[PDB]
Design a protein around this ligand. Sequence first.
Ligand SMILES: *[C@@H]1O[C@H](CO[C@@H]2O[C@@H](C)[C@@H](O)[C@@H](O)[C@@H]2O)[C@@H](O[C@@H]2O[C@H](CO)[C@@H](O[C@@H]3O[C@H](CO)[C@@H](O)[C@H](O)[C@@H]3O)[C@H](O)[C@H]2NC(C)=O)[C@H](O)[C@H]1NC(C)=O
Ligand SMILES: *[C@@H]1O[C@H](CO)[C@@H](O[C@@H]2O[C@H](CO)[C@@H](O[C@@H]3O[C@H](CO)[C@@H](O)[C@H](O)[C@@H]3O)[C@H](O)[C@H]2NC(C)=O)[C@H](O)[C@H]1NC(C)=O
Ligand SMILES: *[C@@H]1O[C@H](CO)[C@@H](O[C@@H]2O[C@H](CO)[C@@H](O[C@@H]3O[C@H](CO)[C@@H](O)[C@H](O)[C@@H]3O)[C@H](O)[C@H]2NC(C)=O)[C@H](O)[C@H]1NC(C)=O
Ligand SMILES: *[C@@H]1O[C@H](CO[C@@H]2O[C@@H](C)[C@@H](O)[C@@H](O)[C@@H]2O)[C@@H](O[C@@H]2O[C@H](CO)[C@@H](O)[C@H](O)[C@H]2NC(C)=O)[C@H](O)[C@H]1NC(C)=O
Ligand SMILES: *[C@@H]1O[C@H](CO)[C@@H](O[C@@H]2O[C@H](CO)[C@@H](O)[C@H](O)[C@H]2NC(C)=O)[C@H](O)[C@H]1NC(C)=O
Ligand SMILES: *[C@@H]1O[C@H](CO)[C@@H](O[C@@H]2O[C@H](CO)[C@@H](O)[C@H](O)[C@H]2NC(C)=O)[C@H](O)[C@H]1NC(C)=O
Ligand SMILES: *[C@@H]1O[C@H](CO)[C@@H](O)[C@H](O)[C@H]1NC(C)=O
Ligand SMILES: *[C@@H]1O[C@H](CO)[C@@H](O)[C@H](O)[C@H]1NC(C)=O
Length: 644
Amino acid sequence: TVSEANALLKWKSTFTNQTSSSKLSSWVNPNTSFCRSWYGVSCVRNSIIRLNLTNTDIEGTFQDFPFSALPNLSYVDLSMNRFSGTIPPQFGDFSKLIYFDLSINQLVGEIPSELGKLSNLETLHLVENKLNGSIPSEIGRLTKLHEIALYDNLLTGPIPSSFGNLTNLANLYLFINSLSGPIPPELGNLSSLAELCLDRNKLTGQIPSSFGKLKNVTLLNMFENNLTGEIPPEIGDMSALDTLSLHTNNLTGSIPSSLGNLKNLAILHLYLNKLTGSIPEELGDMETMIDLEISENKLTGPVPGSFGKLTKLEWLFLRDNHLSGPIPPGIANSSVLTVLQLDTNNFTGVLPETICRSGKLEALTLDDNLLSGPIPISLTNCKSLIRARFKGNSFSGDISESFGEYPNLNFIDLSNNKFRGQISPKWEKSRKLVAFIATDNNITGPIPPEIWNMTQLNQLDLSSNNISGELPETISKLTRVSKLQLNGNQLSGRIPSGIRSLANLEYLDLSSNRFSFQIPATLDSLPRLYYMNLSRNDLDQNIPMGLTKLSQLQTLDLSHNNLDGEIPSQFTSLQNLEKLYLQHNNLSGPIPSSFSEMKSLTHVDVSHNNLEGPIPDNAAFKNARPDALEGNRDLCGSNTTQGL
Ligand SMILES: *[C@@H]1O[C@H](CO[C@@H]2O[C@@H](C)[C@@H](O)[C@@H](O)[C@@H]2O)[C@@H](O[C@@H]2O[C@H](CO)[C@@H](O[C@@H]3O[C@H](CO)[C@@H](O)[C@H](O)[C@@H]3O)[C@H](O)[C@H]2NC(C)=O)[C@H](O)[C@H]1NC(C)=O
Ligand SMILES: *[C@@H]1O[C@H](CO)[C@@H](O[C@@H]2O[C@H](CO)[C@@H](O[C@@H]3O[C@H](CO)[C@@H](O)[C@H](O)[C@@H]3O)[C@H](O)[C@H]2NC(C)=O)[C@H](O)[C@H]1NC(C)=O
Ligand SMILES: *[C@@H]1O[C@H](CO)[C@@H](O[C@@H]2O[C@H](CO)[C@@H](O[C@@H]3O[C@H](CO)[C@@H](O)[C@H](O)[C@@H]3O)[C@H](O)[C@H]2NC(C)=O)[C@H](O)[C@H]1NC(C)=O
Ligand SMILES: *[C@@H]1O[C@H](CO[C@@H]2O[C@@H](C)[C@@H](O)[C@@H](O)[C@@H]2O)[C@@H](O[C@@H]2O[C@H](CO)[C@@H](O)[C@H](O)[C@H]2NC(C)=O)[C@H](O)[C@H]1NC(C)=O
Ligand SMILES: *[C@@H]1O[C@H](CO)[C@@H](O[C@@H]2O[C@H](CO)[C@@H](O)[C@H](O)[C@H]2NC(C)=O)[C@H](O)[C@H]1NC(C)=O
Ligand SMILES: *[C@@H]1O[C@H](CO)[C@@H](O[C@@H]2O[C@H](CO)[C@@H](O)[C@H](O)[C@H]2NC(C)=O)[C@H](O)[C@H]1NC(C)=O
Ligand SMILES: *[C@@H]1O[C@H](CO)[C@@H](O)[C@H](O)[C@H]1NC(C)=O
Ligand SMILES: *[C@@H]1O[C@H](CO)[C@@H](O)[C@H](O)[C@H]1NC(C)=O
């Protein structure tokens, strides 16, 4: 005691970067008050049994720790400090030790195999250190152990097979490590095991079939390993499982139908594997299933209609598989299903009428399938919708009658379909909507003026449709639009000067349209614009000087128009211009020879114009092909088609 108090003081005398305010100030008067007023210290019959110095800013090492002087120690918590160095083998000499915690420290080196001498240990905690090497096999001797936590370390080698002998172990936490080799099948002997967390390691081999005897395990985390083979059907015998996470592995083969037997399983993560074959119909017998994610695999065949039996399903992640056949109505029938992602599959047929029958669905993805037919009515009136993606399908129908008002809509993508009809003004009710993309449809009619009132819109893409009419000056109301694509339509009249107001605009494409008359001269107020495709239009007259005030312009394509006159000398203030396509115009006269000052011009086409004179000094003109520079009236000082 009085010896113990001196020993601990001699240890405390080695701590560095200590403060007068340290909680260890109370380590005073060893002769009288060791067992009554010292912080961390606690005694029985006047001998220290409990040292709890957690989070006391102690900086130091365990070298001069008085192992021999504190024999009756049975509770050591030195966690959340700045301890460094190694774990001396004398820690195994605390024959009475029950709880041992050195976590959240800066300890280095291996784990002394002398820890297996601590026969009375019930909890071992060494997490969040830089301990390396392999886990001592003698730790399998501590058969009173209830919980082993070695996570967030640099441990390597395999999990000791001796750990099968830890018949009282309930929790094994080995994640964030570099453990390797196969999972020892003796882990199946852990009848008392509750949580097994081996995730985020470099484990390999197959999942031991003896895991089926782990009848008390409720959490099995083995994700982000390099496990191989197939999911053994004996995993279906782990009846107490509620969370099974095997994702980001290299597993193969089929999904065992025995997984249906897991009546308490609420989370199943199998994604990012190489699983093949059909999804068994027994996976619908997972009555507790909340979050099923088997996306990003090689699964084939149809989704079992038995998925209507998953009445607690909330998240279904089937994306990036080779699933096929029609989508069964059971797959969306859940009253609580809020995320149904099916994109990047080979689904055929039409959408089931059950899609949003309960009005709780929020995320729906169907990108890159072989679907067709109309939008089901329950989806038309699915006011809860937040994210919708229909890209790359053959959906048909009146785009005005197919889509009701979505107040909660945030992102919808109708690209690459066969939608007909006119854009309804109902989309204005989606006041939180920020991106509207409907490329490559058969949409016709005018853009309703309500669309410009949608100020929250960040991205608007109506390209490759058959939309007509003249753009109103109220287009200036799109304050926050930054990607604007109306190209590939039959919009007509002049270009509205209101595009001057879209200051956030970055990428603007109005090409392949029927815009005619002069480009608005005022258009000098787009400081974020790095792209302007006005090509393949009917625009005629001088290239306005306002375009030369668009500093950040990287690409500028005014090709296939009726522009005339000379290329202005004020292009030089577009120092950041890289690609510039002015071909197939009626431009006249020479370049001012200030194009040498401009540098980043690499791809320039000035073909089929009435210009004359010599090409200026920059790469693109030297690197131009015959087609790039052909067609002009008097090309080059020495009538050249290629270099000088
Ligand atoms: C387990 O880790 C220890 C400690 O390694 C140290 O801590 C890690 C968290 C990393 O930051 C390492 O970069 C860091 O070194 C390893 O022992 C260490 O071995 C190296 C040599 O491999 C030692 O460096 C040498 O130190 C001597 C002593 O002055 C010099 O003469 C040499 O020139 C050289 O600098 C290092 O001191 C040593 N650290 C110790 C013993 O605490 C150990 O090898 C490793 N085991 C593995 C990876 O299996
Ligand atoms: C040293 O003393 C500290 C403080 O008493 C001990 O930390 C305690 O550790 C337990 C471990 O579970 C914490 O229990 C948890 O408490 C929360 C509510 O705080 C509860 O909701 C959880 O279910 C859980 O039981 C406890 O909070 C925590 N106390 C503090 C103040 O952080 C530490 O365990 C002691 N170590 C030794 C060896 O005596
Ligand atoms: C601005 O938009 C226009 C179209 O609205 C883009 O111009 C043209 O796009 C077509 C795409 O099919 C190109 O046609 C094809 O070109 C290849 C080239 O090898 C040719 O082999 C095919 O037979 C076909 O003609 C066309 O070249 C292209 N024209 C230009 C001038 O690019 C244009 O690309 C868009 N602007 C930018 C900067 O991309
Ligand atoms: C291609 O352009 C030439 C150039 O004419 C321009 O006309 C003005 C717009 C102004 O920019 C002038 O500096 C240019 O000369 C067209 O040739 C003109 O055609 C008109 C007939 O409408 C005639 O009155 C002019 O005298 C012509 N100019 C010259 C120099 O001959 C030409 O018609 C244009 N071709 C196409 C297909 O658009
Ligand atoms: C603290 O440890 C000491 C030994 O380091 C224990 O002292 C022994 O106690 C037993 C029975 O109480 C005696 O037979 C021995 O002769 C004692 N040895 C010494 C060197 O004193 C002491 O009992 C322990 N106390 C607690 C509370 O565990
Ligand atoms: C296990 O699967 C992973 C997939 O995440 C593989 O990691 C990829 O390997 C290839 C190169 O061989 C590339 O696609 C990437 O460089 C890797 N990382 C990815 C895709 O994130 C890993 O090689 C597989 N292990 C095997 C087959 O033993
Ligand atoms: C004490 O803290 C300072 C500041 O972080 C650090 O530079 C130093 O290495 C620490 N240790 C000693 C012995 O000064
Ligand atoms: C587990 O304990 C038994 C008991 O005798 C022993 O024979 C066996 O070798 C132990 N396992 C390992 C891997 O050492």
